[PDB]
Design a protein around this ligand. Structure first.
Ligand SMILES: CC(C)CCC[C@@H](C)[C@H]1CC[C@H]2[C@@H]3CC=C4C[C@@H](O)CC[C@]4(C)[C@H]3CC[C@]12C
Ligand SMILES: CC(C)CCC[C@@H](C)[C@H]1CC[C@H]2[C@@H]3CC=C4C[C@@H](O)CC[C@]4(C)[C@H]3CC[C@]12C
Ligand SMILES: CC(C)CCC[C@@H](C)[C@H]1CC[C@H]2[C@@H]3CC=C4C[C@@H](O)CC[C@]4(C)[C@H]3CC[C@]12C
Ligand SMILES: CCCCCCCC/C=C\CCCCCCCC(=O)OC[C@H](O)CO
Ligand SMILES: CCCCCCCC/C=C\CCCCCCCC(=O)OC[C@H](O)CO
Ligand SMILES: CCCCCCCC/C=C\CCCCCCCC(=O)OC[C@H](O)CO
Ligand SMILES: CCCCCCCC/C=C\CCCCCCCC(=O)OC[C@H](O)CO
Ligand SMILES: CCCCCCCC/C=C\CCCCCCCC(=O)OC[C@H](O)CO
Ligand SMILES: CCCCCCCC/C=C\CCCCCCCC(=O)OC[C@H](O)CO
Ligand SMILES: CCCCCCCC/C=C\CCCCCCCC(=O)OC[C@H](O)CO
Ligand SMILES: CCCCCCCC/C=C\CCCCCCCC(=O)OC[C@H](O)CO
Ligand SMILES: Nc1nc(NCCc2ccc(O)cc2)nc2nc(-c3ccco3)nn12
Ligand SMILES: CCCCCCCC/C=C\CCCCCCCC(=O)O
Ligand SMILES: CCCCCCCC/C=C\CCCCCCCC(=O)O
Ligand SMILES: CCCCCCCC/C=C\CCCCCCCC(=O)O
Ligand SMILES: CCCCCCCC/C=C\CCCCCCCC(=O)O
Ligand SMILES: CCCCCCCC/C=C\CCCCCCCC(=O)O
Ligand SMILES: CCCCCCCC/C=C\CCCCCCCC(=O)O
Ligand SMILES: CCCCCCCC/C=C\CCCCCCCC(=O)O
Ligand SMILES: CCCCCCCC/C=C\CCCCCCCC(=O)O
Ligand SMILES: CCCCCCCC/C=C\CCCCCCCC(=O)O
Ligand code: NA
Length: 396
């Protein structure tokens, strides 16, 4: 007996088709937005588009392939392998795009002055092409001979009535589990995810250190102003002005609109030097007087540039957190399937995960191709505003 298999298959297929429609629709919207809006045409978003293209292909190709292979139909074994492994190409391309995005944001926060000369559109396009070629080679490695085509299941073969040279096309009968665990999971998925974690950690550490240095320079300036006003001798005034001069050169070093910026620090450093020249001549009262002028420069220029530096860094932190959420949802959607394969492979004494749980893990991995458009809409204003413009105009 047993419940007719078509009832559970009907549920699985209906859900897969629903996922495919949403993956296509949301990721077409991502691509449309980047095409339409020049504010979104930057190197970081070329990798976003390449990632969206991979998720569109999940809806158009990988999900129809997944539906097909669930039937166990008779097929030439290398045709079966291609149907079984093509999703691994798309998932490897996703990993490469995610890693490139992390490295891009790391270069941007670490050497912002060098970023635009290092990371160019033409270089990014070449990297994307190379990553797609490598993704094919990695995901289709079983077609080069690392496969179970040489050891068919003759009982399944005959019970399904397959012809000569055909196998019943079932994922775990043709794709070796040592490939899936050692090569795909450990080397190709888990190592890059761990690298991505380390890069994001370095981004947040770099932002935190720059904000700290900003605050240190600011408090150094203000405290030494208090020392000068409280002072009773030219050499103490002289000492404090020397500490202010270094903090000021550090802040200028670490902060059109850049010509106004120089003028503010020019007034500041020139005023420190005027007060120091007085100091070396022992005119401490005139030095203190001249040091009071610094307060109007601090209020008119230096505090303004401190605030803009701070807000720029907080925006980069917020943007890096958004992109890291994407990486974390990729891991949440793909790890269950990988972990099931580890049990299958490493615990021969364990009963195999039941079929309903296999298909639930497969559906979960596919739902990853729906979620990124929602993260962009909720977390990134320029995407959200462009989405709104597109829908109101071309759908309403
Ligand atoms: C532009 C896009 C849509 C092209 C899609 C190409 C797909 C549909 C083609 C390319 C290679 C094809 C496979 C190659 C060989 C076999 C083995 C045969 O025993 C069953 C069909 C099967 C499994 C084919 C299924 C269809 C297939 C996967
Ligand atoms: C990243 C997070 C969400 C991972 C979720 C953990 C999931 C994938 C884990 C938690 C408990 C695990 C199950 C617990 C025990 C068994 C019985 C064994 O005979 C087959 C594997 C199986 C069925 C495991 C499959 C994987 C499993 C379901
Ligand atoms: C960064 C983190 C998520 C790394 C992933 C942890 C994975 C590799 C760990 C978590 C739980 C682990 C499993 C827990 C228990 C068993 C049963 C044992 O008889 C064989 C090993 C096996 C099947 C382990 C394999 C490795 C395993 C799947
Ligand atoms: C098969 C389906 C793959 C679908 C691939 C769709 C890729 C389209 C990429 C795109 O149109 O992006 C233009 C970009 O925004 C300009 O800078
Ligand atoms: C099968 C999917 C193959 C998808 C082909 C690769 C698409 C990559 C892509 O669309 O990149 C555009 C580029 O980022 C714009 O500057
Ligand atoms: C694009 C258009 C492809 C349209 C074809 C969509 C996929 C059709 C698959 C199919 O019809 O399978 C035939 C079946 O094997 C018969 O016995
Ligand atoms: C295209 C969207 C529908 C997915 C087609 C699934 C399919 O054609 O599978 C038939 C299977 O090959 C029967 O043996
Ligand atoms: C591209 C759109 C859909 C691809 C559909 C996937 C291709 C489905 C192949 C179906 C097939 O090979 O059917 C053989 C069967 O044994 C005959 O009875
Ligand atoms: C571009 C689409 C390329 C489509 C190429 C389709 C090839 C299908 C095929 O080769 O099927 C042979 C089958 O195994 C005979 O038994
Ligand atoms: C680096 C990757 C570049 C692409 C490497 C391409 C290697 C050649 C693959 C090949 O020749 O395929 C053999 C065939 O699949 C067996 O049946
Ligand atoms: C999303 C929530 C539930 C979807 C559950 C999807 C999986 C439900 C069970 C599917 C199943 O058991 O599949 C039978 C198999 O396809 C026979 O060949
Ligand atoms: N183990 C596995 N199985 C399947 N499909 C087969 C599910 C199944 C498993 C056993 C069985 O008797 C009948 C069906 N797809 C699968 N996809 C993956 C995968 C993709 C990326 C990482 O793991 N693993 N994987
Ligand atoms: C969205 C679809 C919601 C479906 C909810 C209930 C359907 C029952 C699911 C049971 C699946 C049984 C398949 C099986 O165990 O082989
Ligand atoms: C996720 C689903 C998003 C739905 C938005 C519809 C966009 C339609 C389109 O641009 O083709
Ligand atoms: C299969 C699904 C394909 C998804 C394609 C994604 C479409 C997004 C943008 C591509 C834009 C193509 C050029 C449009 C020309 C119209 C114009 O520029 O006036
Ligand atoms: C688009 C409509 C797709 C219809 C569903 C096809 C699955 C039927 C099947 O498994 O043979
Ligand atoms: C701008 C993005 C362009 C993407 C280009 C992708 C082209 C890759 C196509 C073929 C790669 C060949 C890798 C070899 C895989 C094994 C071949 C096989 O056995 O079928
Ligand atoms: C990897 C394990 C967990 C991933 C969690 C997904 C990240 C989303 C968190 C939401 C948030 O930061 O507010
Ligand atoms: C990464 C390290 C994983 C090492 C795997 C341990 C091999 C055990 C031998 C076996 O399970 O067959
Ligand atoms: C979803 C919760 C996972 C629990 C799986 C139970 C394992 C089993 O039924 O053998
Ligand atoms: C997700 C929902 C599907 C859960 C199906 C679990 C019941 C399995 C039926 C059974 O074999 O007893
Ligand atoms: Na993806």
């Amino acid at each position: 007996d047993g419940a007719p298999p078509i009832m559970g298959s009907s549920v699985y297929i209906t859900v897969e088709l629903a996922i495919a429609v949403l993956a296509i629709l949301g990721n077409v919207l991502v691509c449309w937005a980047v095409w339409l809006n020049s504010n979104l045409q930057n190197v970081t978003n070329y990798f976003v588009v390449s990632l969206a293209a991979a998720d569109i292909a999940v809806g158009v190709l990988a999900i129809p392939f997944a539906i097909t292979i669930s039937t166990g139909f008779c097929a030439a074994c290398h045709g079966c392998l291609f149907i079984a492994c093509f999703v691994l190409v798309l998932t490897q391309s996703s990993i490469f795009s995610l890693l490139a995005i992390a490295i891009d944001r790391y270069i941007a926060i670490r050497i912002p002055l060098r970023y635009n000369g290092l990371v160019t559109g033409t270089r990014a396009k070449g990297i994307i092409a190379i990553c797609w070629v490598l993704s094919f080679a990695i995901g289709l490695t079983p077609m080069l001979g690392w496969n179970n085509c040489g050891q068919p299941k003759e009982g399944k073969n005959h019970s399904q009535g397959c012809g000569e040279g055909q196998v019943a096309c079932l994922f775990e009968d043709v794709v070796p589990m040592n490939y899936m665990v050692y090569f795909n999971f450990f080397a190709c998925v888990l190592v890059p995810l761990l690298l991505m974690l380390g890069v994001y950690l370095r981004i947040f550490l770099a932002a935190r250190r720059q904000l700290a240095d900003l605050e240190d320079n600011w408090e150094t300036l203000n405290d030494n102003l208090k020392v000068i006003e409280k002072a009773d001798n030219a050499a103490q005034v002289k000492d404090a002005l020397t500490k202010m001069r270094a903090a000021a050169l550090d802040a200028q070093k670490a902060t059109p609109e850049m010509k106004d910026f120089r003028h503010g620090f020019d007034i500041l450093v020139g005023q420190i030097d005027d007060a120091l020249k007085l100091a070396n001549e022992g005119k401490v009262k005139e030095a203190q007087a001249a040091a009071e002028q610094l307060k109007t420069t601090r209020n008119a220029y230096i505090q303004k540039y401190l605030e803009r530096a701070r807000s720029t860094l907080q925006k980069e932190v917020h943007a890096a957190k958004s992109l890291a959420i994407i990486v974390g949802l990729f891991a949440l959607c793909w790890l269950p399937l990988h972990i099931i394969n580890c049990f299958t492979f490493f615990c021969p004494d364990c009963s195999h995960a039941p079929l309903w749980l296999m298909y639930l893990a497969i559906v979960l991995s596919h739902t990853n191709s729906v979620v990124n458009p929602f993260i962009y809409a909720y977390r990134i204003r320029e995407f959200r505003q462009t989405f709104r413009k597109i829908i109101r105009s071309h759908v309403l």
